[PDB]
Amino acid sequence: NSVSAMKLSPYYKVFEEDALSWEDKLNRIMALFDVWIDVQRRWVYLEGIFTGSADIKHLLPVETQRFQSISTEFLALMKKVSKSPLVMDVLNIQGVQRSLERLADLLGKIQKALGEYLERERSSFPRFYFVGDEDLLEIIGNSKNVAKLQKHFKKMFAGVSSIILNEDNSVVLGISSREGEEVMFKTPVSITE
Amino acid sequence: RDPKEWIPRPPEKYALSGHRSPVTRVIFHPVFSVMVSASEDATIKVWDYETGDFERTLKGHTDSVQDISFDHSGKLLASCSADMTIKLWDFQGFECIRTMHGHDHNVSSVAIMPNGDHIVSASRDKTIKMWEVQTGYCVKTFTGHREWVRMVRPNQDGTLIASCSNDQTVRVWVVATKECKAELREHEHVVECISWAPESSYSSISEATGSETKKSGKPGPFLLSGSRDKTIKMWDVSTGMCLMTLVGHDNWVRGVLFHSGGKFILSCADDKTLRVWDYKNKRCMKTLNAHEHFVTSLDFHKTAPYVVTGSVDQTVKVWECR
Amino acid sequence: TDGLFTHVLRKIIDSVRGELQKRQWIVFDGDVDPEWVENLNSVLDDNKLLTLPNGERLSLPPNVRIMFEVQDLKYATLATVSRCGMVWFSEDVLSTD
Amino acid sequence: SGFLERMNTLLANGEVPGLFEGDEYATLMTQCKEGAQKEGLMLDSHEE
Amino acid sequence: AQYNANHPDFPMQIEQLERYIQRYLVYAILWSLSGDSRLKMRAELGEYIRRITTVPLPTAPNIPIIDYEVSISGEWSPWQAKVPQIEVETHKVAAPDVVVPTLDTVRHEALLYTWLAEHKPLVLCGPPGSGKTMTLFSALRALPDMEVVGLNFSSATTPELLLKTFDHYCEYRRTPNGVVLAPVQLGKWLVLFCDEINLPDMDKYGTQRVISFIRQMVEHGGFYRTSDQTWVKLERIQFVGACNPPTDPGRKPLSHRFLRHVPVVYVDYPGPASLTQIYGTFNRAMLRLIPSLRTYAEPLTAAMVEFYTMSQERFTQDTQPHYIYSPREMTRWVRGIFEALRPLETLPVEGLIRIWAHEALRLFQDRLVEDEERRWTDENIDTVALKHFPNIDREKAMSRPILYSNWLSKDYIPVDQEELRDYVKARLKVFYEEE
Numbered sequence A: 001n002s003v004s005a006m007k008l009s010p011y012y013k014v015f016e017e018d019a020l021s022w023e024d025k026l027n028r029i030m031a032l033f034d035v036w037i038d039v040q041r042r043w044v045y046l047e048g049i050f051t052g053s054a055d056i057k058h059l060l061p062v063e064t065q066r067f068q069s070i071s072t073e074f075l076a077l078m079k080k081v082s083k084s085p086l087v088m089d090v091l092n093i094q095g096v097q098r099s100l101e102r103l104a105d106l107l108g109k110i111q112k113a114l115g116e117y118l119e120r121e122r123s124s125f126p127r128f129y130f131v132g133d134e135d136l137l138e139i140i141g142n143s144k145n146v147a148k149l150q151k152h153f154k155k156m157f158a159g160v161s162s163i164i165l166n167e168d169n170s171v172v173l174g175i176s177s178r179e180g181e182e183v184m185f186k187t188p189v190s191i192t193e
Numbered sequence B: 001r002d003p004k005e006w007i008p009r010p011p012e013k014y015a016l017s018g019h020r021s022p023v024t025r026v027i028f029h030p031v032f033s034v035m036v037s038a039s040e041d042a043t044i045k046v047w048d049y050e051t052g053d054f055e056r057t058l059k060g061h062t063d064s065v066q067d068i069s070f071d072h073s074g075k076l077l078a079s080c081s082a083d084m085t086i087k088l089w090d091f092q093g094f095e096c097i098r099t100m101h102g103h104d105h106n107v108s109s110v111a112i113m114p115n116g117d118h119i120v121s122a123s124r125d126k127t128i129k130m131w132e133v134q135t136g137y138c139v140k141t142f143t144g145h146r147e148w149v150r151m152v153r154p155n156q157d158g159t160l161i162a163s164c165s166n167d168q169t170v171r172v173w174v175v176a177t178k179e180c181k182a183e184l185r186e187h188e189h190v191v192e193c194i195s196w197a198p199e200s201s202y203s204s205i206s207e208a209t210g211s212e213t214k215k216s217g218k219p220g221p222f223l224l225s226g227s228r229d230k231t232i233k234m235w236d237v238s239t240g241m242c243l244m245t246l247v248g249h250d251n252w253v254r255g256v257l258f259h260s261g262g263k264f265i266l267s268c269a270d271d272k273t274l275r276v277w278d279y280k281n282k283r284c285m286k287t288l289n290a291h292e293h294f295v296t297s298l299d300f301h302k303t304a305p306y307v308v309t310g311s312v313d314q315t316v317k318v319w320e321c322r
Numbered sequence C: 001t002d003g004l005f006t007h008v009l010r011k012i013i014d015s016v017r018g019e020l021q022k023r024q025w026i027v028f029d030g031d032v033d034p035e036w037v038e039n040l041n042s043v044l045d046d047n048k049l050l051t052l053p054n055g056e057r058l059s060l061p062p063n064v065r066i067m068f069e070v071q072d073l074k075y076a077t078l079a080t081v082s083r084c085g086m087v088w089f090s091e092d093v094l095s096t097d
Numbered sequence D: 001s002g003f004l005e006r007m008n009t010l011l012a013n014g015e016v017p018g019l020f021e022g023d024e025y026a027t028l029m030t031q032c033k034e035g036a037q038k039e040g041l042m043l044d045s046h047e048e
Numbered sequence E: 001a002q003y004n005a006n007h008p009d010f011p012m013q014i015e016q017l018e019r020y021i022q023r024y025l026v027y028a029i030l031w032s033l034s035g036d037s038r039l040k041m042r043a044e045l046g047e048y049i050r051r052i053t054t055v056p057l058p059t060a061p062n063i064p065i066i067d068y069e070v071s072i073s074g075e076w077s078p079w080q081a082k083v084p085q086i087e088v089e090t091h092k093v094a095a096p097d098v099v100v101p102t103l104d105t106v107r108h109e110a111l112l113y114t115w116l117a118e119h120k121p122l123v124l125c126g127p128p129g130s131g132k133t134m135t136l137f138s139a140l141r142a143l144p145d146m147e148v149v150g151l152n153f154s155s156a157t158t159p160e161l162l163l164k165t166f167d168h169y170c171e172y173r174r175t176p177n178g179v180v181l182a183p184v185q186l187g188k189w190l191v192l193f194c195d196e197i198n199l200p201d202m203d204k205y206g207t208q209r210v211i212s213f214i215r216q217m218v219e220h221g222g223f224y225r226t227s228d229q230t231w232v233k234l235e236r237i238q239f240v241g242a243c244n245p246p247t248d249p250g251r252k253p254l255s256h257r258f259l260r261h262v263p264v265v266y267v268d269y270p271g272p273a274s275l276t277q278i279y280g281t282f283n284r285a286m287l288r289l290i291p292s293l294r295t296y297a298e299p300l301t302a303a304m305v306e307f308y309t310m311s312q313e314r315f316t317q318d319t320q321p322h323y324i325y326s327p328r329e330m331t332r333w334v335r336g337i338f339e340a341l342r343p344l345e346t347l348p349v350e351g352l353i354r355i356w357a358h359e360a361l362r363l364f365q366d367r368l369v370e371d372e373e374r375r376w377t378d379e380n381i382d383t384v385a386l387k388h389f390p391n392i393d394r395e396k397a398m399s400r401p402i403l404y405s406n407w408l409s410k411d412y413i414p415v416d417q418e419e420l421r422d423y424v425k426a427r428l429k430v431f432y433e434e435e
């Protein structure tokens, strides 16, 4: 918005070149990071599926090895990012945009190959039948980070909008509704056990 | 004679020889104590394996008969021949009740589905066709093989059919919706024969290959593929992985099947030998010098302790298992 | 596979890029017939849910308004009319001046 | 003699550098992606 | 400079630098003025230099200077110190990547690394199968920043082959100084290996168009793009050539204007001692498959070398153009014996001799035209194996129908002629109906 406001200003002619250069820089930054956030989220909830499940290796072997290849490439890219975590440095990484697009396509292809696994996992918890494939994948993959599961409880329960957790986020102390009404469990449920 | 441990023994019971051309395939009647053998002289001779006496010849095919099969009841016999026709035989009256055309080339396999209402056949025009038993109409056509399809075999419940071809691949199809469930390509040569695993062998296969028990309880249908690279491979249809490779044959494998008890694998090849495989340890137990020329086919009786093998020497041999 | 309206509503609900913090208005500019507008019966009712045939139910966020811009309601049923707040724009509203 | 030149290159190297050009190279790369996937290999660069 | 980089605390001193420079100057004079001549002429040049020079020289009474490198410390060290009697893994017996180190091999690799590091074009000259491609690839393994691309020249070769290679492996990018041709990958020097540089036809006016093209690309650092008449400058592109001696049939002497930019190294055939070393190492690695046969490695290698030498002298290009014998045939001999011995758990000496004879027949007799030549090959195989392997069953290992096949078994084992005939009759019966 500041660049556009400078463009509409009359004194912009002398500063056209640098303003255009920074506009290009910002546009490429946004274009990269919009793909980056989705790629990161998909990898986050796919690694949980492919590591926390022991039977997925035997039921889905080809996609299993595919995901280890994709995850190894992703971790190599992440290590390169961690080496020089400056935003221009990762922006100027050779072929970062094309690599991100390839990673997004590969993760999407892997995600669409998990339909049978999620359909079979639905039988264990019956309320998973009212949760979509994307949200179910997020739930199962991100079971460790229970802070981000609070938005999926309204789709599975009549009035349980969120759950109440302790400081460690390891024992479930109760449930809550949309209006803030809370029910405190007499015997709290331990996630660690 | 352990009711699920007998294997064939070297001294043959009978050596039946009435065919004028190489015996293509031999099968057992599911109910009666009678045997049927197809040969290249366009004849289907019927033998009794308790006393080893010829009974009658089923003629009507113009060219060499390539395959024969029985329905569950044993009241119908379906035979395919090199003259591009499939004939259905009323095995009570021994008359051909229906002839089915529609394949464009040599029909090299035929199988009656377990329900007994459909006939599946493979031919040299690279297609697999389904025929109604009652009407004789072609109702389905499984295309996708790139070469001559050599065999077609339905599974126990008839929901899946496997096929092998000269294109060195084994394809598993879905009967209901025609889709190709799997494409098993690991043989380095043409795949000759296939066979499904009986449910009595599922636990044995699982504990021999080390496969962990699935949460369903169904290990997944298992398939075999003898091929011309002298090897036998056991597949898991559900995952498409080759569980084991059985090496030891000296020539092209022609037929392969399980022991009815699901403890051993019986295979015959062109090395003139019939071999008993202990797939528990992935090794061959017994080797039988079966015939004096190529051994084309074998069958293992479901209940009685008898093995029969046909051969190119125009001789059908019955083996007592002890 | 999500349709246009389902995709828009799901993207707003997920709020990956802070959609829940804005004023999201979905305007249906076009004709209304019971074939497509009756699927919004739960959306425009107190349920505030978009029920899909696959069993998924999408709750309407409090910042989202479903809007219809139409010229006539000669084919909409009573179920659609009773579920929405009506604003009538007579032709005298926009004078030639 | 061009036949023999192509044979010489193909026999010695197993590949002809100028055989696939333009759209043919793109089609070949797509088919090689498919084949490498069918052989359990992930290959993305056209130089691999 | 590299040594000074390796010793920041103790750079090179003036006296050590002077000694090293003198020794390296003599070494370079030898390898530049005699690198393209036989061993005798290298020895003659070394003797002449020893007579005329004043620098310190090795004190060996008979070992010529060409066997001594120049250590960075500034003293002559023999090349034999870099030639160890290695033990090859049994699964890497006579593999294409495997190079058994030898005096000639290490000397040529050092010289090529010296020339390749400067990005100077070079040509390896020698008889076919002498080891030019092997030596070049082994030397290129020491230069990770170089990608080699193989080109095979023929009598119909034109610059279009090089242009197609450039289109595949390189890109024409526009720069302010002009168009520049560089490899698609970055930081790597493309090496164009041209295997038959002196085969391309000379016209009636005595010139090879591709040789002129390469000379223009080397001297002027670029060429002309004939589509738009734009000068194209090469970047990070290197040329290496190989060729048979120009006196060979079908070979033409290269232009003197092309040779001045290209040093030539002569890679002759390994001698009987070098052949014995290399293929005795290969046989020792081989015969560990069957421990009972381990004691026969030396006589087996001796018989192989003797028969190879006799066949090489007996059959030459004067009789037939394809009568070319090289260490490549010895490598195929080793590979065939290894592949026949691999699935066998145990084997008597007579079986090993029969496999040796079968491979000798398949390598040296199949290409012969006349029947007298094949009779000579049979008789001399028999005599060689009798000479080097006495006290063995002559008939059991030399039944003249020496046939080996994996058609009647899972392995490569000897097959009887009648059994093979019956099997082939049955297979033909199937073949008629199928194909």
Ligand SMILES: Nc1ncnc2c1ncn2[C@@H]1O[C@H](COP(=O)(O)OP(=O)(O)O)[C@@H](O)[C@H]1O
Binding pocket: E098, E099, E100, E101, E102, E105, E127, E128, E129, E130, E131, E132, E133, E134, E135, E242, E270, E278, E327, E328, E331
């Ligand atoms: N020192 C050595 N170690 C291993 N193999 C050798 C050695 N010297 C020669 N050879 C054999 O000689 C052959 C040389 O062939 P090659 O290098 O292709 O010749 P050219 O370059 O003339 O075509 C190779 O097959 C190699 O096995």
